[PDB]
Structure 1
Amino acid sequence: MSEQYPVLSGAEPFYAENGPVGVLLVHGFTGTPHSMRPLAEAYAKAGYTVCLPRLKGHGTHYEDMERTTFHDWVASVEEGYGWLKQRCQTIFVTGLSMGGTLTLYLAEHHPDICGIVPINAAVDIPAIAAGLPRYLDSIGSDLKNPDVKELAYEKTPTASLLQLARLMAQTKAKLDRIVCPALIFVSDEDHVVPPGNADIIFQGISSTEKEIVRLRNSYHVATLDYDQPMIIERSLEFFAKHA
């Protein structure tokens, strides 16, 4: 039931108690809080209360991850949402890749969320269905800047890919439940999540305030990539406008 490996250095969750407006930040599949930490730190510095959880089975070992289901990942984010709810009158959610999937999922089940900022969020990855081994060699970090050292698992359990697929299917099916304002980031040259996902989301949600922001200087892991500053800056403008 519980993780058998210790939390990796750099993968620790981040909390900051500040003002009555809160931001939940969700990292991606096989990733860790590291991928979201510069965003989380920038938002805390700006006065927002911040919750950046570590998804169960993540930031330890891929053998731990293999033992989890998507319900465990949903639970980590529901717990972080709960933490903010006990402290904040206004709550926004943002996330990278599956973190974006989970941002959408949370907004589909909680109408009180005041806005979402999905970043290369994933609701359909046809490569999963197309593609044996218990663990796949993880693909290198899809980052335009080669100097960044993303903290992510070096192997991906195939059983976990199935979990990701089911989560995405449920999330995609319920997109029309979302009505809160949406700021949707997409890397034109995302080599992991097809960029058309941004439009599945834009068209699928029922929100009246929505836009897509195309990032032209980043690959998949945009939160750590050259476009990081713009992600942070526009996200802060978004939070202020809707708080």
Structure 2
Amino acid sequence: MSEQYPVLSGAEPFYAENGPVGVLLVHGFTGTPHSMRPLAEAYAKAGYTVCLPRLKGHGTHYEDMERTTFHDWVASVEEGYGWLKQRCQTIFVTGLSMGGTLTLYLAEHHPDICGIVPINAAVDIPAIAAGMTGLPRYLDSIGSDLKNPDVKELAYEKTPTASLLQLARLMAQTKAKLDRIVCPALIFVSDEDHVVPPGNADIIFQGISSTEKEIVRLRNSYHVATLDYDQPMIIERSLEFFAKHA
């Protein structure tokens, strides 16, 4: 049931105990805490308690990932949420890509969350269904969709097809339950995301029941926006959002 491979260098989770306002940061599918670490460190330096977990099956080897289900990834996030609940009076959740999906999923089940910051969150990726139809156990992963080519992202070099099915099911369930969300939402979307169609931001904006919601368009980033040129804006605007709603 446990992972068989060791944690990769750079994929370690990050925890910081600071003040009574906490932020949970969720990384994406086949990715690792590396993609959220600059945000986590900035929020900790700003005085927030921070939890950046490593999703089960992630940051080790794709064979470990293949053995996981979306319920395992949800459990990692629920565990991090619980860690914060034991420490903080106010909790925000943010996440990139499937991490954004999991942010939404958590908010659909926990009304106490005080705000969410999904970044290129995925609730519908038609290419997954199209990809089947018309095969192999592991697909060659695409290179990281980053506008800045100097940035090194840590993600598995192969993607298990079994795991894509798990992602599809997670997305469908998350999409179906969007109207349960009423907390404030700051929805970031890269205009030029080549992985998650940017209309996802509008599915989310229209689907949630929140009265305080906005879409912020990132014009200088591709999918992996947390490591891309718009990173400072994501951090600054997120910090403003946390302060306003705490």
- Give TM class, smaller chain: over 0.9
* Pairs aligned (count): 243
After superposition, what is the alpha-carbon deviation per residue over 1:101-136, rounded to whole angstroms, capped at 9, x for unaligned?
A: 000000000000000000000000000000701000
Moved beyond 4 Å, runs of 4+: none
1:150-169: CA deviation from partner (whole Å, max 9, x where unpaired): 00000000000000000000
**1:93 match: secondary structure:** strand
Equivalent residue of 1:235, what SS? helix
Q: Distance in 2 between matches of 1:148 and 1:5?
A: 25
Q: Any stretches of 5+ residues in structure 1 without a counterpart?
A: none
Note the C-alpha offset of 1:214: 0.1
TM-score scaled by length of structure 2 = 0.98
Q: 1:71: which partner in 2?
A: 71
RMSD over aligned CA atoms reads 0.5
Q: Distance in 1 between matches of 2:15 and 2:228?
A: 23
Q: Equivalent residue of 2:36, what SS?
A: helix
- Residue 7 of structure 1: CA displacement? 0.2
Task: Provide the rounded CA distance (Å) in 1 between the counterparts of 2:142 and 2:9.
Answer: 21
- Per-residue deviation at 1:44? 0.0
For 1:97 and 1:32, locate their aligned partners in 2 and report how far apart those are by CA, in whole Å: 12
Deviations 1:75-100 (A, max 9, x none): 00000000000000000000000000
Between 213-222 and 129-138, the greater mean CA deviation after superposition: 129-138
Taking structure 1 as the reference length, what is the TM-score of the superposition? 1.00
| Inter-partner Cα distance in structure 1 for 2:94 and 2:64 | 25
What's 1:178 paired with?
Answer: 181
CA distance in 2: counterparts of 1:156 and 1:221, whole angstroms: 17
User: For each residue in 1:35-94, what CA deviation from the matched residue of structure 2 results, as whole angstroms up to 9, or x when unmatched?
Assistant: 000000000000000000000000000000000000000000000000000000000000
CA distance in 1, matches of 2:192, 2:161: 25
Q: Corresponding residue for 1:231?
A: 234
Percentage identity across aligned positions? Answer: 100
Q: For each residue in 1:2-26, what CA deviation from the matched residue of structure 2 results, as whole angstroms up to 9, or x when unmatched? A: 0000000000000000000000000
Q: Give CA-to-partner distance per residue, 1:141-184, whole Å, 9 cap, x none.
A: 00000000000000000000000000000000000000000000
